[PDB]
Amino acid sequence: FVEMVDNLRGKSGQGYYVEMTVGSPPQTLNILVDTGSSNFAVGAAPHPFLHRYYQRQLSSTYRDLRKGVYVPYTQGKWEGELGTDLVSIPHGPNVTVRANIAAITESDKFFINGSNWEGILGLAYAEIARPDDSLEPFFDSLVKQTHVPNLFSLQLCGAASVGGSMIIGGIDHSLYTGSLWYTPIRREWYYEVIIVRVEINGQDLKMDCKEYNYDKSIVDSGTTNLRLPKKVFEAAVKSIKAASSTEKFPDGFWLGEQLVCWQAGTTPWNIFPVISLYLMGEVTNQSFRITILPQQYLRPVEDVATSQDDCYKFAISQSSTGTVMGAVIMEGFYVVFDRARKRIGFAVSACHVHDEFRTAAVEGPFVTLDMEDCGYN
Amino acid sequence: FVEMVDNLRGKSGQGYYVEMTVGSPPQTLNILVDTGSSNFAVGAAPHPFLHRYYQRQLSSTYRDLRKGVYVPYTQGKWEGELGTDLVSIPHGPNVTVRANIAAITESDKFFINGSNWEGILGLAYAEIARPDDSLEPFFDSLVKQTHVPNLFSLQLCGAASVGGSMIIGGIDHSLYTGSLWYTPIRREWYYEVIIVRVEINGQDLKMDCKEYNYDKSIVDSGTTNLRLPKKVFEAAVKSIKAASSTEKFPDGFWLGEQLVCWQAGTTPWNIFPVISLYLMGEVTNQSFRITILPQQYLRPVEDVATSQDDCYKFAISQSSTGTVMGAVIMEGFYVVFDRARKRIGFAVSACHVHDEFRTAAVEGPFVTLDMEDCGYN
Numbered sequence: 057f058v059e060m061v062d063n064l065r066g067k068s069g070q071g072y073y074v075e076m077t078v079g080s081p082p083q084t085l086n087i088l089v090d091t092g093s094s095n096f097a098v099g100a101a102p103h104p105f106l107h108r109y110y111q112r113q114l115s116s117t118y119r120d121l122r123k124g125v126y127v128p129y130t131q132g133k134w135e136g137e138l139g140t141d142l143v144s145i146p147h148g149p150n151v152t153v154r155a156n157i158a159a160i161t162e163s164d165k166f167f168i169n170g171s172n173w174e175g176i177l178g179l180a181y182a183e184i185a186r187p188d189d190s191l192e193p194f195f196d197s198l199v200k201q202t203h204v205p206n207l208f209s210l211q212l213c214g215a216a217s218v219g220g221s222m223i224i225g226g227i228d229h230s231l232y233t234g235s236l237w238y239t240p241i242r243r244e245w246y247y248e249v250i251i252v253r254v255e256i257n258g259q260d261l262k263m264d265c266k267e268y269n270y271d272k273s274i275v276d277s278g279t280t281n282l283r284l285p286k287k288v289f290e291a292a293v294k295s296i297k298a299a300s301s302t303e304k305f306p307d308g309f310w311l312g313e314q315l316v317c318w319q320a321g322t323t324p325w326n327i328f329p330v331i332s333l334y335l336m337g338e339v340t341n342q343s344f345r346i347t348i349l350p351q352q353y354l355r356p357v358e359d360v361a362t363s364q365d366d367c368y369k370f371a372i373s374q375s376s377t378g379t380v381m382g383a384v385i386m387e388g389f390y391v392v393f394d395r396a397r398k399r400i401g402f403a404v405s406a407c408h409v410h411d412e413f414r415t416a417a418v419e420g421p422f423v424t425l426d427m428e429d430c431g432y433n
Numbered sequence: 434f435v436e437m438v439d440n441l442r443g444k445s446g447q448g449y450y451v452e453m454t455v456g457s458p459p460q461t462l463n464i465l466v467d468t469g470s471s472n473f474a475v476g477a478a479p480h481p482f483l484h485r486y487y488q489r490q491l492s493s494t495y496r497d498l499r500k501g502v503y504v505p506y507t508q509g510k511w512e513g514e515l516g517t518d519l520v521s522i523p524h525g526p527n528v529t530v531r532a533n534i535a536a537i538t539e540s541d542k543f544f545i546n547g548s549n550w551e552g553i554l555g556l557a558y559a560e561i562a563r564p565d566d567s568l569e570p571f572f573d574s575l576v577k578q579t580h581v582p583n584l585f586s587l588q589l590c591g592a593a594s595v596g597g598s599m600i601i602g603g604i605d606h607s608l609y610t611g612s613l614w615y616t617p618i619r620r621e622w623y624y625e626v627i628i629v630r631v632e633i634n635g636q637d638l639k640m641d642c643k644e645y646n647y648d649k650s651i652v653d654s655g656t657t658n659l660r661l662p663k664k665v666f667e668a669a670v671k672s673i674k675a676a677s678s679t680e681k682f683p684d685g686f687w688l689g690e691q692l693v694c695w696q697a698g699t700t701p702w703n704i705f706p707v708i709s710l711y712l713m714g715e716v717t718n719q720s721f722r723i724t725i726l727p728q729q730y731l732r733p734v735e736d737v738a739t740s741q742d743d744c745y746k747f748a749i750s751q752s753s754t755g756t757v758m759g760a761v762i763m764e765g766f767y768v769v770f771d772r773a774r775k776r777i778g779f780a781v782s783a784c785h786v787h788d789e790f791r792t793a794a795v796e797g798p799f800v801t802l803d804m805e806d807c808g809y810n
């Protein structure tokens with residue numbers, strides 16, 4: 057799988073993309089790797105922010121499905137025209153395949169001005185695949201049409217300009233140290249999992265188990281932040297705040313309403329806590345824990361148009377769709393989406409940003425009771 | 434105040450704007466009326482989506498304040514350069530004034546491609562005025578520098594193309610029928626108020642009082658939706674769902690993940706509930722209630738690029754910053770922001786969209802105990 061190592065590029069806060077080709081003859085496009093949705097979509101008209109776009113007129117193998125698709129957000133959106141053509145992945149496995157494709161033809165706040173990607177790859181499951189679950193996701197199609205094993209893994213590094221590896225087909229043991237630990241995929245819609253216990257530094261939020269996964273905890277290459285629900289963000293942030301009382305910072309800052317700054321080589325790593333999420337483990341009453349440094353949740357804002365100092369942003373933030381384990385968490389770890397086995401594995405990333413003191417860990421086993429009672433229904 | 438009647442234009446879901454002039458000689462710009470923030474900001478560089486922009490080079494009366502300003506969102510943002518020049522409002526009161534102005538010089542997902550506004554007018558209070566409360570908001574400046582009375586009112590109509598009236602200086606009794614009822618402004622930061630009871634159709638959500646204002650209920654001309662917190666959105670939506678069991682609709686729809694449709698002249702108003710929020714009243718244990726129809730929370734998506742039927746959207750949605758009473762609620766009513774008296778008044782809007790059956794109401798007085806215990810602290 058060295059072929060596939062280092063095959064993801066991207067820029068800070070704009071997401072990770074992989075090169076794919078679509079249609080015969082092949083039209084290359086950078087597509088954004090997204091474990092939080094289940095549609096394969098490309099810009100198909102000359103939107104001014106796109107470097108490239110799907111020109112269906114140049115592909116012999118295109119096939120309209122005479123149907124629309126209207127994916128809204130809060131408040132982005134995109135809409136398009138379902139077709140099917142032959143997709144391939146240059147720095148991936150050596151299979152071409154025929155998958156569905158939404159040709160994006162109108163959109164709001166979807167494309168990012170100054171990014172180098174022209175489309176999304178939704179690697180989650182049919183159940184959330186708009187317009188409805190009849191729309192067979194790419195990865196279901198890739199597996200169903202080849203010998204390629206039903207899994208993929210992701211090592212998102214991020215150094216400005218970011219990089220990583222999407223190993224389609226298996227695991228590459230050069231991307232991680234220590235051992236992989238597995239939390240089961242609770243249901244095949246998003247990559248939904250269950251945090252059974254949350255510590256900041258060691259002392260946990262003694263919160264009711266259910267509040268960590270209200271109404272959902274998911275793993276998302278497509279979200280930037282670690283996103284906690286309101287009740288829990290409230291809780292975590294207070295313990296983070298108390299933790300962090302070598303100093304004071306503005307109120308808004310925490311709610312992602314300002315940046316905070318120090319000078320080159322002059323930031324306090326160690327005044328800030330390590331965080332640890334315990335995820336449900338493979339066995340009854342067994343769990344394990346993954347631990348992030350503040351390098352992961354304090355991420356620099358690169359080009360700030362009125363600032364020369366180190367102005368990092370706070371990467372943890374609130375929600376109502378649930379916990380979203382974004383690049384903040386995922387950049388700590390080699391993450392394996394074992395779809396074959398309804399489970400996600402976490403190991404210490406061979407490229408995560410560690411200092412001389414602390415470090416990211418994946419550690420187990422621990423004993424946790426009533427892990428199943430931390431779902432919501 | 435007829436001078437000021439009908440002085441707001443806008444387009445569906447894109448917001449309400451009023452014409453202002455900035456600098457000498459005066460440069461006209463459409464600015465977006467926003468009760469949810471406290472900064473006056475104009476695009477000052479040729480962003481491709483702007484019709485117009487502040488050219489400080491043409492104004493004698495400009496004055497740099499040699500300071501930046503970096504307003505992020507989730508995940509829009511803008512940043513700019515604080516100055517001060519002479520603002521006026523053509524279809525407003527006949528005063529020119531010297532207020533602060535952030536010249537917006539970089540931004541992300543802030544301006545709307547295809548809108549006709551080039552700036553924001555933040556009519557809330559200094560406390561939330563970025564970069565900090567020393568930045569005197571326009572309206573504080575307008576009052577402090579003229580005889581203009583410390584209040585304004587808003588009648589947002591929305592019919593496509595929307596319209597309304599911002600009466601700066603007082604109230605115009607032609608804009609409402611019945612009587613005005615006043616909920617007090619709890620703190621002068623946002624226009625924060627307190628919902629003491631919530632019904633759908635009549636039967637309330639029997640929810641703990643605090644969950645309606647966790648952590649905030651505000652009144653926002655700048656938000657489109659009625660936005661409830663997660664716990665309460667969960668609650669309301671279930672009662673809305675049960676209410677609405679003459680029919681079934683997709684799961685996503687409710688979470689603003691799809692549109693829903695019927696044919697021209699063929700939509701079920703009456704299968705859907707009226708909603709009623711009870712707001713804290715002026716006297717101890719006294720409250721009143723405002724009531725919206727489904728015309729207010731079911732708002733048409735205008736030009737849909739793969740649809741000919743009536744496809745309305747669901748205007749109620751979740752949050753973690755709190756309740757946000759947006760154009761959904763505000764379009765029902767003539768809303769008076771009596772800043773002089775730390776209070777907001779609600780009357781039946783002379784332009785709200787009512788059918789022959791039901792109608793929007795403002796009704797009181799009711800008896801409600803422990804209204805003060807519905808805050809959060």
Ligand SMILES: Nc1nc(CCc2ccc3cc[nH]c3c2)cc(=O)[nH]1
Nearest residue numbers: 069070071090092093176276278279
């Ligand atoms: N997992 C996702 N996918 C999306 C759509 C793709 C997208 C759009 C913008 C950005 C910015 C950074 N990553 C992005 C991904 C939205 C979302 O809410 N969750």
Ligand SMILES: Nc1nc(CCc2ccc3cc[nH]c3c2)cc(=O)[nH]1
Nearest residue numbers: 446447448467469470553653655656
């Ligand atoms: N009250 C506000 N003001 C803003 C900024 C202005 C704005 C931007 C986009 C739209 C779309 C519809 N109305 C808008 C207002 C953001 C926000 O979250 N709350």
